[PDB]
Design a protein around this ligand. Structure first.
Ligand SMILES: *[C@@H](C)/C=N/c1c(NC[C@H](O)[C@H](O)[C@H](O)CO)[nH]c(=O)[nH]c1=O
Lengths: 240, 98, 265, 200
């Protein structure tokens, strides 16, 4: 259908970024929106057909091209902090009629004046309360991802080498560890609840995995701690 | 397919009083398709300073145009409108009858 | 007075050199108000009172729309010509619009033509498409399968178009809502014919006819077309042929913008 | 146009009905769209209205009144998976799609057998944190963010053990403070009177 890339990205202010967007549905109309908290989707640029493009509500800092039907790249010539947002590419068979929009997955972009305070998550798993097992015959593991910034994080649970979703509840939003600060680092919790009989099997393996989108090779790093590149941080527990 | 031959009407803006400056009109209408060639004729010869409206569209899908030039009508000056169209095998000449 | 707003599109496959493959212009009544073609690729005003009252934002947005419409119009003509199995150059046309009548009632219409003949005609009350042949029938089926587009069109024709019209009517009221009365005369032209001739009038809507003995409308009247004089006013005529062996008394009757006129000969 | 207005957030109960309102002031109207957007995901098309009245699609219906300038999205027999944002968008006279700020719909699960308790999870060898789990409480319970800046508390989260057709609320609290117990972790929230605190 329609694909957007990359989907998560940290950027030094001043860098040039191009977000890619492609659809093979042969749609004539394509759109770039940014989504920001408390506001409705705001149009950046659009294109009703190949060979033309128009300016949306917030074009400044951005440019597009549409030489062909399939592709609609959004370029930020020189990124600035205010361009941290979630960018959605969308297409429609024709512009301005009743045909709906088909949205790409969204691209999360954080533009930073200084990479000095990017941190990866610390990940830890905590094994179920024995009292819970006795009281409920269920067993809840908890995973915590803490101290990360920015909040480009995806947590997943893994039982015996395969990802699970049943019995899982991950916070929909991360929490600010220090709500006052604007460069506050973040925390995220998740839970995996199983039957006591499943937990009490010695061969059952539990792993909490957290994917972090961070710096890249070409990003300059000067801090005395480890360079916070894109990485997976995980933690595990065995049944008892 | 149906091709429709242009109606051609030649007439002055105001009632023509000989010796008094006026506008000579050639209203070309009802034709289809839209490609058409229109000339106003001065005693048999084409006039160079001729103006015309943009191609116009009628409800019945045909087209119309108005061609016009300023002129001082005299008794001996005969005026005409020459149009060509795909429906026409050779240019059709319509005289201004006062 | 009754007023109307309409937009036409013309598409040509394989046009001769120089001639655009796509043209679109709007009218209010007889006055062009907007134009666009595949050469300029810009929507532009064709009346001073449009340019003066619509910000560049209007022209920019609809230019982008028209560039899209241009492409789609080519694809649609291509599809029609394939289904008709036609070679060479053929035309595709569209007309959309609405009328606001004097009594305050409205009409709305949308239709298509291929090679200058009706092809598809919209009925916004039955929400359906009339097809004139089986090529049109195929399109009708695809179009009618998309109920939202029909609903959308009913709404645009009945509400939005009328709102646009009232708006342009205000913009151009000095032109569109003025009245210039006709100057009317009768001329005699071995057969004699009476010509009733009107000129200098605006709006172009005018009713001219011949009566005999003031009681009956004459059969066999030759009607002239209402023609632009070039100065923004119009002219027209009507004629009858006289019967020397008849004792009929004739008179020209003209109606224009609420005024009636009789010229007894 | 100029304004599209919808409530910031709505909370209803599993199995009930909710009406999400969207009012619009626009210059011209060419139809109104509803989109669903799950958190962290792409909006997906729900409905389009442009003439007056009610149009049904499964559990969802969409209503429009042009004269009043509003529409609602009606969700019947609410399920947890309806938890999402619902976005309103109107096409104006220039066919510009103008988007409302979205309504976040929160759904309270029907907890058939509440058994509120606070548990202490087992310490991790690789962490200095101790972790407390408030769980199996009824959906009317709200969890407050803590007062102590060095104690962190997560919003309640509904998990679904689909195998056993069982749903439960929980919230997590953690700290590295030496003076931090599970018995006091959620003291800033109004918790059920029968909340079970296992002795250490
Ligand atoms: C400037 C407003 C040009 N408009 C224009 C239109 N407009 C009418 C209508 O919006 C359109 O035809 C479609 O139904 C989609 O809404 N139509 C047209 O053909 N040409 C024009 O230049």
């Amino acid at each position: 259908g329609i694909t957007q890339a990359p989907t998560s990205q940290i950027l030094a202010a001043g860098r040039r970024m191009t977000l890619r967007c492609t659809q093979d549905m042969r749609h004539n109309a394509m759109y770039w929106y940014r989504q920001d908290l408390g506001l409705g989707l705001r149009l950046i640029h659009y294109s009703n057909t190949a060979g033309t493009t128009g300016k949306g509500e917030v074009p400044d800092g951005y440019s597009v091209s549409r030489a062909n039907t399939d592709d609609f790249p959004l370029t930020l010539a020189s990124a600035v902090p205010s361009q941290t947002s979630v960018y959605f590419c969308a297409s429609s068979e024709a512009g301005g009629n009743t045909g709906e929009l088909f949205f790409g997955e969204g691209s999360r972009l954080t533009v930073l004046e200084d990479l000095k305070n990017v941190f990866p998550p610390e990940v830890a798993v905590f094994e179920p309360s024995e009292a819970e097992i006795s009281h409920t015959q269920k067993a809840t593991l908890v995973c915590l991802a803490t101290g990360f910034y920015p909040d480009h994080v995806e947590l997943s649970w893994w039982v015996n080498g395969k990802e699970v979703h049943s019995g899982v509840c991950t916070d929909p939003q991360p929490l600010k560890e220090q709500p006052a600060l604007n460069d506050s680092r973040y925390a995220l919790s998740s839970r995996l609840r199983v039957s006591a009989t499943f937990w009490q099997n010695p061969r059952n393996h539990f792993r909490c995995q957290v994917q972090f989108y961070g710096l890249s090779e070409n990003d300059e790093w000067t801090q005395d701690r480890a360079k916070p590149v894109t990485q997976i941080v995980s933690a595990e527990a065995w049944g008892r | 397919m149906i091709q429709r031959t242009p109606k051609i009407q030649v007439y002055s803006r105001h009632p023509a009083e000989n010796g008094k400056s006026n506008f000579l009109n050639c209203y070309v209408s009802g034709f289809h398709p839209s490609d058409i060639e229109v000339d106003l004729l001065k005693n048999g010869e084409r006039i160079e300073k001729v103006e015309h409206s943009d191609l116009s569209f009628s409800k019945d899908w045909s087209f119309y145009l108005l061609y016009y030039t300023e002129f001082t009508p005299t008794e001996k000056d005969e005026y005409a409108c020459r149009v060509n169209h795909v429906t026409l095998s050779q240019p059709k000449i319509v005289k201004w009858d006062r | 007075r009754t007023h109307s707003l309409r937009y036409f599109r013309l598409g040509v496959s394989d046009p001769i050199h120089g001639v655009p493959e796509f043209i679109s212009v709007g009218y209010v009544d007889s006055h062009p108000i907007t134009t666009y073609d595949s050469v300029t690729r810009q929507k532009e005003p064709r009346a001073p009172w449009m340019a003066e009252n619509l910000a560049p934002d209007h022209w920019e947005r609809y230019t982008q729309l028209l560039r899209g419409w241009q492409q789609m119009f080519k694809v649609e003509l291509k599809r029609l010509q394939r289904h008709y199995n036609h070679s060479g150059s053929h035309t595709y046309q569209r007309m959309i619009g609405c009328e606001l009548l004097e009594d305050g009632s409205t009409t709305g219409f949308l239709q298509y033509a291929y090679d200058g003949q009706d092809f598809l005609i919209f009925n916004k009350d039955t929400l359906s498409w009339l097809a004139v042949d089986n090529v049109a029938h195929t399109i009708k089926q695809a179009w009618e399968a998309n109920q939202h587009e029909l609903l959308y069109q009913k709404n645009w024709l009945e509400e939005e178009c009328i709102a646009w019209l009232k708006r342009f009517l205000e913009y151009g009221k000095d032109t569109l809502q003025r009245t210039e009365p006709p100057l009317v005369r009768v001329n005699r032209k071995g057969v004699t014919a009476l010509f009733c001739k009107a000129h200098g009038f605006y709006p172009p809507e005018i009713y001219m006819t011949w009566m005999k003995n003031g009681e009956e409308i004459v059969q066999e009247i030759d009607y002239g077309d209402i023609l632009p004089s070039g100065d923004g006013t119009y002219q027209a005529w009507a004629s009858i042929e006289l019967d020397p062996q008849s004792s009929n008394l004739y008179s020209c009757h003209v109606e224009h913008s609420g005024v009636h006129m009789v010229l007894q000969v | 146009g100029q304004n599209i207005d919808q409530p910031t957030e709505m909370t209803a109960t599993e199995g009930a009905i909710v009406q999400i309102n969207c009012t619009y002031q626009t210059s011209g109207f060419n139809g109104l769209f509803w989109y669903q957007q799950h958190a962290g995901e792409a909006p997906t098309f729900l409905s389009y209205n442009v003439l007056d009245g009610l149009e049904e699609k499964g559990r969802f219906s969409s209503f429009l009144s042009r004269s009043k300038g509003y529409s609602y999205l009606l969700l019947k027999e609410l399920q947890m998976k309806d938890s999402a944002s619902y976005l309103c968008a109107v096409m104006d006279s220039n066919f510009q799609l103008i988007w409302g700020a979205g309504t976040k719909l929160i759904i309270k699960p029907d907890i058939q057998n509440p058994d509120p308790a606070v548990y202490q999870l087992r310490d991790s060898k690789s962490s200095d944190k101790s972790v407390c789990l408030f769980t199996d409480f009824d959906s009317q319970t709200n969890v407050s963010q803590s007062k102590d800046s060095d104690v962190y508390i997560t919003d309640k989260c509904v998990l679904d053990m689909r195998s056993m057709d069982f749903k439960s609320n929980s919230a997590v609290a953690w700290s590295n403070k030496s003076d931090f117990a599970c018995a006091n972790a959620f003291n800033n929230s109004i918790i059920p009177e029968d909340t079970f605190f296992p002795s250490p």
